[PDB]
Amino acid sequence: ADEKRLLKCILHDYDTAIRPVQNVSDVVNVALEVTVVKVIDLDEKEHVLTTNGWIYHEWNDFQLKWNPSDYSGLKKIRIPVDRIWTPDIVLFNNADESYRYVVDKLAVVYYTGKVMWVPHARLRSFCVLDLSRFPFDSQMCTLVFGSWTHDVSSVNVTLRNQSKVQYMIDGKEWQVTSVQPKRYQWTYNSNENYAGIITGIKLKRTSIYYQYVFIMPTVLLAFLTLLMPFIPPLGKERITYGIGLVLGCTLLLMMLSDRMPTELGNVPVVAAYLAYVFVMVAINLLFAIMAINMSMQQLTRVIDRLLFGSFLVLTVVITISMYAHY
Amino acid sequence: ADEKRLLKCILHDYDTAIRPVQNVSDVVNVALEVTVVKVIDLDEKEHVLTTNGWIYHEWNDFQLKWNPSDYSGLKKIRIPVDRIWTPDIVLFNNADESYRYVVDKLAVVYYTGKVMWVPHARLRSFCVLDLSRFPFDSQMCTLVFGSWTHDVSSVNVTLRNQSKVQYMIDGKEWQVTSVQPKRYQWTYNSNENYAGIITGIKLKRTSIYYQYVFIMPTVLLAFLTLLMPFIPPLGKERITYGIGLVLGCTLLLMMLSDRMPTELGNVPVVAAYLAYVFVMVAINLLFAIMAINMSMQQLTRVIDRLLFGSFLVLTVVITISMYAHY
Amino acid sequence: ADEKRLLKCILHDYDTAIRPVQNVSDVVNVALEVTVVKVIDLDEKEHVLTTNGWIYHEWNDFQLKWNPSDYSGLKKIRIPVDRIWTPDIVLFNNADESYRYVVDKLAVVYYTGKVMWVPHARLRSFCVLDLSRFPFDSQMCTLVFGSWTHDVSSVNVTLRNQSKVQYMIDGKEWQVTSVQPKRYQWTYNSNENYAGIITGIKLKRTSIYYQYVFIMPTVLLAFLTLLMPFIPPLGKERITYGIGLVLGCTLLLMMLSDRMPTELGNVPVVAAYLAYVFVMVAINLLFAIMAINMSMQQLTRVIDRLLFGSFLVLTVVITISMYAHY
Amino acid sequence: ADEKRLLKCILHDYDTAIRPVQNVSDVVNVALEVTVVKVIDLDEKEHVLTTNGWIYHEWNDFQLKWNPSDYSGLKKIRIPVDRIWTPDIVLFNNADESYRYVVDKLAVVYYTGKVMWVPHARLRSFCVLDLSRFPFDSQMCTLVFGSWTHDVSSVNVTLRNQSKVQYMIDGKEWQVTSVQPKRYQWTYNSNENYAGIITGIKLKRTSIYYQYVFIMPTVLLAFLTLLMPFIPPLGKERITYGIGLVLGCTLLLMMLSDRMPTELGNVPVVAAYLAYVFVMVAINLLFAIMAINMSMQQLTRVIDRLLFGSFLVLTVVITISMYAHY
Amino acid sequence: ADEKRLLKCILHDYDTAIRPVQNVSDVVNVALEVTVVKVIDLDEKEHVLTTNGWIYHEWNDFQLKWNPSDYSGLKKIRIPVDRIWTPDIVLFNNADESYRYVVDKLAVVYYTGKVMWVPHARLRSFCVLDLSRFPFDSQMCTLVFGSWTHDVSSVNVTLRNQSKVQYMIDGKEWQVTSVQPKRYQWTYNSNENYAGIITGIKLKRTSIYYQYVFIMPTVLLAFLTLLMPFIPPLGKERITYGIGLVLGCTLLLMMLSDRMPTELGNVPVVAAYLAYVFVMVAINLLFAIMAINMSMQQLTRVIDRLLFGSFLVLTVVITISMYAHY
Ligand SMILES: *[C@@H]1O[C@H](CO)[C@@H](O)[C@H](O)[C@H]1NC(C)=O
Ligand SMILES: *[C@@H]1O[C@H](CO)[C@@H](O)[C@H](O)[C@H]1NC(C)=O
Ligand SMILES: *[C@@H]1O[C@H](CO)[C@@H](O)[C@H](O)[C@H]1NC(C)=O
Ligand SMILES: *[C@@H]1O[C@H](CO)[C@@H](O)[C@H](O)[C@H]1NC(C)=O
């Protein structure tokens, strides 16, 4: 019954609310180390990013102190979080309604007072997404941790001394690159001062699904539109061909609107290209109608030749411009 | 060993339900200050607005009275909400099934009794939206707080003394402007009266998603329907081209219905425009079928000339009318 | 103080399970008064109706009593439900997995056992919806409450003394009419007798999106189908016109099915009209194929004239028949 | 008070974990009676069935032994579930993460010791659906209950002595037919054995939406495909009309895939019919293209006449075979 | 009354945090065995696998020890886990926000200390999808359990003495094949040592939904696109028929993208085949336009004959190449 007597002696008058400090004026240097292990989802409909990971907490505890020489060693003791003081550091921009936790019900404590508590959670946060380069984009995400209840006058949110956590987690659909965290002084008001720890996650859209399913049909229908003027106006299918392109392009517009989120910043390049081929269809149908109703000598040959050349040059320049980004 | 002494000597017989007032007949002038920090979503499908923010409360505690002179200063103390009396003020029209909380497990207390409890939560509320101006609308939202358990005979929901809280919080899809809150005399019944705190949120749609997705294709194919009747009846393509507009406009109606909500006030201007180009296609198909039936001397020239002119003038007037909004 | 000693004296041995009655054989006249404040949704996919509101609970408490006269009055005391006996009155047809409560952790009680506990909740209930008149329907909804643990031999479940609760809270998408509640003698089994309190809500469909998204396109597409007999079969576009209507009607049925739910009673009028216009496309394509086969003497004039007349007259009679509902 | 004396003297040493048995080797006779009152939904996408119901139990309590003669009657006592022993009966195929209950916080108890502990809940069970006979299907599926925690050495899991459970819960969208429950002696291994209670539900799919949304469009387009071959190849509309059927049938396939679940056993007959008419379109387009190719004397009259005859007879025979189930 | 005596004697000083070991340095050999009873679903959109199953634990307890000979046998005693020390075994890749359990609040223990805790849960794990063979794939995926709180210095996560768990749980939509679990030494860092238990599952997609939904329409439209170039360019329907293919393929791509998940690694063969028939329709529209505008002697017969030969041979070779694997 050794651990039992340790629990009895060290839970003598231990309240779970008192600040674990020796001097009331002094603060406690609380360390933090966030580490994401995998990305689950990135839903741009609400700019929500859900990735699982673990947070590493350190703080020396004044009352937690004992000698292992006469206590048969056993320097590491596992104590549930409910019976021990718990830091209040949370995510500023959590997306979940309640800040839930996973297997965060047990923490290890050392004889000196060092506590290697390692909570794990599936963090859901918000980050700003640059949809202009979509899908060939490099949208950064930011994960920021800090305390809202107490201020710097209580605790000192610092970084780990050892920062050898420069890993690269590449997935089958998204590439995650870690960024060295920094400490910034958040300001809550003029009188009171706060603190925060920011870390960066490079998101690389390595999933071929988006570009392969979207841009390929758009460029194909652009190819079809490029060939419209070769059809003679008398074929009675020129208008039908163009209106078929109209229906197809509306179909791609609808699917893109279903997929590409309502919460939008700058216009996406794929949406701009689709709208550009859409006005392409508008203009070339207009010219086809002009040719056919002018027919009823037919000099439409020069007209649609210079027409075709103009669309050749403009389509090739827009295609190279959009390809230069990738 | 001092803070523990304060907790031992100040929580002697402190219940979690007794009103913290000295005179039983007297009420407490409880303060309130809400502040939204970021907008998450505005789903008009149920008129739900989800924004994260923080609420600020103040009330002097008669029981929690002591002097910092003889207790070695330390006027700032952190006590969990579970061990202290808690105001019951909540939000009237919350959308969540349970009125959840985030990091609302610790509050600060002073020597006088000044308690700056700062809960944070992602509030989901309801407010009426003016869809007549959709998507170029500036639909107000209302965030309102009050007490459902007790009435003015118990507390006094007042505002923060500092009212210069005019901040400019803009997002990537909406821009948010704060309005200074006001206190109103709510009436639960004839005998008893309650208080309410109401604040206004200017939501201005800065997202470019709606316009590019809906209006541009619709307006350009409205232009196409404007220019369609130049096709001769004998070309055997007027019916096909018009029915292609029929299919395309039905697809646009489908996507708008999937997006534009069921809960509707006045008809949206975009929906009205789409229905009007739909009846446009109906009418010009009518006229084209009548003309082709009559053809099978050349009396259709005047008919479709006046047709084209009349639809030019009505299309230009409707376009300027809808553009006058923005 | 005064409140503290009163709570100490009145919560000596008050269990949260003993029936608050003086005579064991006697029952307690528990009164209920439900009041809806706003409607959230009517999801006909599972015939679920979600509306927020508050319930007014009344019962006596012989065990809990005092004399305020010698105790400086103060007859109004707020006590959380966790420390007081609580009726088990629940909704019969709740949709949530757990019958949750909102800000119902405090109840006001007076001196002579007339506690005024007012729980609030967003009730999600089940009620039959009459889709035969959709969208011009008046689907009644029913909210029924009672006790399932104990029977009339324990409690009463009566109504409030005054019934002046005839409020007209109509929304921007639904019109809500309250109906005065009634008490009915529910039976739990043959041996035991129970009670139920039922209130009715008249739901008037005032949403305009439904009709402007469904009836207008179907009615004008039926109109367009009425135009096709004028086109000569030899024009090679009559078949194209008919197949275009076929595709349009298929799309129309598709998003109608996507919107109009699976759980259904009598067939909706819009579905009947859609099936009708499908029957028209079938019949008139049949006759067009017959005419074109005959052409490739010219007696189709009388045939399609009588076809056109019969179709127009029966279409107009069914349209006025369905218009008679609204 | 008297009931307070009962509670004090009957929970003197009552733990909420000890088996309520007198003899250690003896087991306790627990009964079961499950009754469904209203089905919520049947989502075949995950083979989940949400039905609202209640569960009735019987077990004598050795501790709850006393006589009402000396205690002034009072043979009906209300005891909350938290302070009393409860069986661990659980549905084997629940879908909710937690075995949630509704108003399961109170039970009755008598001097004999019988308990009408009757929780109500919305059970989301897993049961197999035979989609081959859609919509003319009679798919039985079952709810099975048991004790996964403890084994037969503790309890008995029997049925009610009175099995007068011949009640039919009729609905406007689904008909529920109850089957008498059964008991099986589950065998894990030589050392451990279990038990299970079975209730069977006949699901009559009385919803009329499914037929009007799926069979009607498919059969009408089958009629059009059957009657198309009269269109002469020289009309230049046969190919367009057939490809219009292609588009329509693809749209039907897409809507069926959206509705008819991914989790599938045998192919649905409606899906088979749609695929068969779609390959019908493919085959007769093949023949039409071959005929128009060989056109440039008209030998196609006999060819497409025998085509029409063969395909009409096969279509009518497959339709009557499909309908012969009823 | 002996069971209560046993509980009183064996729960004297049993805390829920003390490691249940005799020697503090010594660890406890904890054995584990996971077993899936039924798979719910495999959603590749988020790479989530929902499988109903149960976990089997083994560990001795130094404190829990008694002689059944002097206590009238009764070596099997059910105690809830809320009062007994419990290992913190957790899935590494759980998808649920909370690692919830189903009816796992009771465990029977033996006199020797051998514990039969039998938790059941709906495990939501992460699975990697090798969608190269989609849908005819054999995507194995794994479930791994470990101790994230404490390390090997506390307990030893081992396996059972026997591993005769070679069961074949076939479903109507998916075939589940268990794989013998293994033990791998997870490393939290260089200094500390952790452990992990891994199990694998062969997932055979026995569902016939995907093939009938996607491959049959794709293959037959590819066949008819193969056979279409027999249409003469002057028939005025070749362009119309090709654009009909364009529209149909666009709808099919839309529905496939809506169904086939966004989270993708390598391209599925079905999506590749659809894109390749898109390339096919683009190419033959190119050549059809070339033929029609070169018609305005007619040597296009050789051109489209060799065209037809080239596409037939490439299509047959690619189809047999993709079919040979299955
Ligand atoms: C504590 O906060 C101080 C603020 O001056 C900061 O510089 C540092 O990161 C923290 N730790 C120390 C004492 O170095
Ligand atoms: C409550 O606050 C109000 C400010 O609106 C002010 O009249 C006074 O301080 C208090 N009086 C009451 C009890 O209304
Ligand atoms: C409830 O009390 C009322 C008092 O009017 C009485 O009529 C009845 O006995 C009680 N229960 C019923 C059946 O309403
Ligand atoms: C209890 O189960 C036993 C078998 O263990 C069997 O006789 C019967 O089904 C049940 N009835 C009783 C009380 O014997």
Residue numbers in the entry:
A (entry chain C), B (entry chain D), C (entry chain E), D (entry chain A), E (entry chain B): 12 to 307, 414 to 443
Original paper wording:
In this work, we studied orphan receptor Alpo4 from an extreme thermophile worm Alvinella pompejana. Each Alpo4 subunit is composed of a β-sandwich extracellular domain (ECD) and a transmembrane domain (TMD) made of four trans-membrane α-helices M1-M4. In conclusion, Alpo4 has a pore structure consistent with a cation-selective channel, but with an unusually tight constriction at the 16’M position, the role of which remains unclear.
Either CHAPS was removed from the Alpo4CHAPS using size exclusion chromatography or we purified Alpo4 without any CHAPS present. Similar results were obtained from the sample prepared in LMNG without CHAPS, reconstructed to 4.1 Å. The unmasked reconstruction (red) reaches 4.9 Å while the tight dynamic masked reconstruction (blue) reaches 4.1 Å.
